[PDB]
Design a protein around this ligand. Structure first.
Ligand code: CUZ
Ligand code: CUZ
Ligand code: CUA
Ligand code: CUA
Ligand code: CA
Ligand code: CA
Ligand code: CL
Ligand code: CL
Ligand code: CL
Ligand code: K
Ligand code: K
Ligand code: NA
Ligand code: NA
Lengths: 586, 586
């Protein structure tokens, strides 16, 4: 007998116990919450354009985004923290972009997106998870949609032999592509084991159809399992192809005339399975059945035998398939032997014992279902604290539901999502908080307070703005001290320091049509004294936090006097922290 | 007073938070302080497609080219000095705009760029007999014309103007040229008078210059006199704008018919009408005081019956360091933020008024420490004669240690204070992104929202007229219209299927996709994303939405529904097929 009775109120002056990193869904950002208060502490722009910080407007951010800076949107579902020996190391957060086919990396010491990649020769990055062991060497990412190769407009048929999608591995540290694996069917969600050898992904479109009925035709789709050791061996030996103008090694993981690839095995699983979740004891890949009212449990310790050809049937790695309820979508773990699964249709979270499900599969009469909790309403992902690590602590559970209906004040035709906090510390789940959120977070991830270490002020050598420091070097500029205007034909480069309540350059004059770059170094050393920079009626806006250098480029297309001001309230004389751009007529 | 809203309980008040330089409006429930909705206004919203869709860009006009805004001052329309819940208005200081939000659909439905001005900062609404005018301050002095010949702020044609917008039409009504500049503004409870603070009476551009005078002033506007001069045709126009412009400057020491200038120390900031209608209260900022202007003495001031503009001042209580803003409990007490001392001071207005007559009396009742450096503050219904004295939000600019570390950029701290009793009680610390400046609360029963769209809503009526030219009936048609190098796709949607699931175009075609969500069930919203084309929008039940993009890439391109709407949501998808340009003319 142990009861669920954790404190939920975080009063003035008290601090949260966990960080929560919420995906922003089709709003495109990442949100940092405090747990258990469920208050949003910070927003990290990633695929959105952020008016406040200038992400998407500044030269530093557009350099990280590359050519994809032309997009103003993203759709990000699956945030994950890098690991060392199967435990969070607090270094990086990665997330997908389903809308423009990207993966982004966030540095958790500065809480900024510091790298972004457009995955080549695919459409729509959905599923994303990280290698756990020995550490996060690879980010694994699913491309969801089957497309022609090449996609040059000659062939549109998804049944053609060169229409397919690929599993993607990105080098976590360099954020360059490592390899791609062609698969049969498509790819939904993915997870990795606790050794580094295996990863797995659900497939819902084994039919390679484009219509709803066609995509639901097969009694079973599959989870495809990847022998990452085998893939690495083939890349190391150089036997791969490349596609288009991308140098990424491409390996063929499709079945050929019934014959298995070295790189993959296809484990039949009902039906349009969705979630793909590694148990924290590392025993199971658990696929949520969605259209089937089940989960399927793949025994990871049978996968070597499967790939060695020792097993008569790929279904032999299935060791449990418990019946849970209508519309299972995702599963998480308390570290105590229980799994917790969302039932989208029944609108519940079901708590069940994994080892008892395995014994039921053998035909033992044993009830593995422990409890069903109503949630509100239609849950998608759920996440228990540290569930993606061998330190899963069984304390907090968030169920992220898609219809809030009557749970909050009405706010028009568009409704918030309902992310509900559930106490799982004891024998019974207890619903303790309804958290409304914008734009459909899909998944979230929690970390202990002590697993995240952040900078209080920027380092002057930070790679985030090192290209800008390089530009300054070519102009002979010492960013820490200089207040100067460089003139270069019709280009103008303003460099200034800033120190509340004054910009270091408070007026400058240019010619109508000049392309103006303004670089600002915040030389305040007091924590929290951020500055801003807005040029009135020019669409220019950006953050400069303590010891940061930030820069932005715009064309002075309007003759006359044009004011600029500090947007970050920074001092009693904030309103007076202004300057003038004077534009001489053409 | 209930502080906590548990699962299944609803908040008692709506809160409408400004987003500051993040550019949106945020809808909170009070007292839980949870964010229920985001309403994009000057920001580009990836989730709903605000700034990408044709409906939103139509409302933004040419200013749709800007991806940023800086909004500070949200206010709710009134009838006879009470909220009527029809509209919310807000400023854009970055690109000189005013936006209107329709509170039944919680969307921005109108936007205006204020002509011949730079930086719309202060904004407030006429109270009586209703909100006929939106009053808005242009903060920065500029030359007229601003054509690059003259830059001097001391030129006789360099000035700023006070701005009145017709609330219902969202067209300019008039502009009043003023001496000095403009900061914040409020209106009386008769409709005759508005008032604004000025901090740059010096017409300087440097910090020392702007602080030189011991007093600036609050300028008072006789709206009756302005309206009468407009009716009589007694006005000019500036540049290409037909807005009536009136001259409220002093000339050679003689007052305008339209304005009186009340000397007030010192770089004063907040300008707040007491809920009993007695006072304009200006916060002294650099002077440790507030100055109370007796509204019932203004008739005598404009009739030349007073010896000295100071004679309308009837109190100037000393409150503490850095008074910024004042609000009201409706019980005769005022509450003022002290930015420097980092407190809210509660004081009794009538006792301050007799202390100004020399009657020694302690008008200060309590000082509450806030965390840290408060800017605006807001008591529930403070802007109406229904000011109820229950809740107070102080919106602070430095959160320092009050929340978990999240890197060099910190959240703001908006603190909920119980003022229902004699003693202010700090109950909740609410972290927020991007610097909310002001917020406004409304009782739950003052806001009436629509659960699904009306098919004749003006928000998308232009789109309906477009469809009519094509013979479309949006409620039923699934058609692809071709028109040269334009393609107009019209479809219905109903979970989990798009009404048009594939279409074919030529490379280079300009494609418009119009979607009408014909689901009738509340909260069943759909989305639309074209992979790798930067296209994303919301379509909520009974809404029509449209978006335009170029099919610049040959081949098959998937589109999908971004709003989780159904168990088969992963499968609500379609295909755009783009025929290569080398197979088509040119
Ligand atoms: Cu993209 S899917 Cu269950 Cu993760 Cu939401
Ligand atoms: Cu724009 S100022 Cu006190 Cu309102 Cu923040
Ligand atoms: Cu710098 Cu406010
Ligand atoms: Cu329509 Cu999900
Ligand atoms: Ca299938
Ligand atoms: Ca002054
Ligand atoms: Cl998953
Ligand atoms: Cl238990
Ligand atoms: Cl104010
Ligand atoms: K939703
Ligand atoms: K701040
Ligand atoms: Na990159
Ligand atoms: Na307009």
């Amino acid at each position: 007998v142990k009861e669920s009775k954790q404190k939920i109120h975080v009063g003035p002056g008290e601090l949260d116990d966990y960080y929560g990193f919420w995906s922003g869904g089709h709003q495109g950002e990442v949100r940092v919450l405090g747990v258990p208060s469920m208050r949003e502490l910070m927003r990290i722009p990633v695929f959105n354009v952020d008016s406040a910080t200038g992400w998407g407007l500044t030269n530093e951010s557009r350099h990280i985004m590359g050519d994809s800076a032309k997009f103003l949107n993203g759709d990000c579902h699956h945030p994950h923290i890098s690991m060392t020996d199967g435990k969070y190391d607090g270094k990086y957060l990665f997330i997908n972009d389903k809308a423009n086919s990207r993966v982004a990396r966030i540095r958790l010491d500065i809480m900024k997106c510091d790298k972004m990649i457009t995955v080549p020769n695919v459409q729509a990055i959905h599923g994303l998870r990280l290698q756990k062991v020995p550490h996060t060497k690879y980010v694994f990412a699913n491309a969801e949609f089957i497309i022609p190769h090449p996609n040059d407009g000659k062939v549109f048929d998804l049944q053609d032999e060169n229409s397919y999608t690929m599993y993607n591995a990105i080098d976590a540290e360099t954020m360059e592509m490592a390899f791609q694996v062609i698969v049969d069917g498509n790819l939904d969600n993915t997870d990795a084991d606790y050794t580094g050898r295996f990863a797995a992904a659900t497939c819902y479109n084994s039919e390679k159809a484009f219509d709803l009925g066609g995509m639901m035709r097969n009694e079973r789709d599959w989870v495809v399992v990847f022998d990452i050791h085998a893939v690495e061996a083939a890349v190391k030996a150089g036997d791969f192809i490349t596609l288009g103008d991308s140098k990424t090694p491409v390996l063929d993981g499709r079945k050929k005339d019934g014959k298995d690839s070295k790189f993959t095995r296809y484990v039949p699983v009902p039906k349009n399975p969705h979630g793909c979740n590694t148990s924290s004891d590392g025993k199971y890949f658990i696929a949520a059945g969605k259209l089937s009212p089940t989960c399927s449990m793949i025994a990871i310790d049978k996968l070597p035998d499967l790939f060695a050809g020792k097993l008569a049937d790929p279904r032999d790695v299935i060791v449990g398939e418990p019946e849970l309820g209508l519309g299972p979508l995702h599963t998480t773990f308390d570290g105590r032997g229980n799994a917790y699964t969302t039932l989208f249709i029944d609108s519940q979270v079901v708590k069940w014992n994994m080892e008892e499900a395995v014994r039921a599969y053998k035909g033992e009469k044993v009830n593995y279902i422990k409890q069903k909790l109503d949630v509100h309403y239609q849950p998608g992902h759920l996440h228990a604290s540290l569930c993606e690590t061998n330190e899963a602590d069984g304390k907090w559970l968030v169920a992220l539901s898609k219809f809030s209906k009557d749970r909050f004040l009405p706010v028009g035709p568009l409704h918030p999502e309902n992310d509900q906090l559930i106490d799982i510390s004891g024998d019974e789940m207890k619903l303790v908080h309804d958290g409304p959120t914008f734009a459909e977070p899909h998944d979230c991830i929690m970390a202990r307070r002590d697993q995240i270490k952040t900078k209080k002020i920027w380092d002057r050598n930070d790679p985030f703005f090192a290209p800008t420091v390089e530009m300054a070097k070519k102009d002979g500029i010492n960013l820490d001290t200089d207040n100067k205007v460089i003139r270069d034909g019709n280009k103008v480069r303003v460099y200034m320091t800033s120190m509340a309540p004054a910009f270091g350059v408070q007026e400058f004059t240019v010619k109508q049509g000049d392309e103006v770059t303004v670089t600002i170094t915040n030389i305040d050393q007091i924590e929290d004294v951020s500055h801003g920079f807005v040029v009135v009626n020019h669409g220019v806006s950006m953050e400069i936090s303590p010891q940061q250098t930030s820069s932005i480029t715009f064309v002075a297309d309007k003759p006359g006097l044009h004011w600029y001001y500090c947007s970050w309230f920074c001092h009693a004389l904030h309103m007076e922290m202004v300057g003038r751009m004077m534009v001489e007529p053409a």
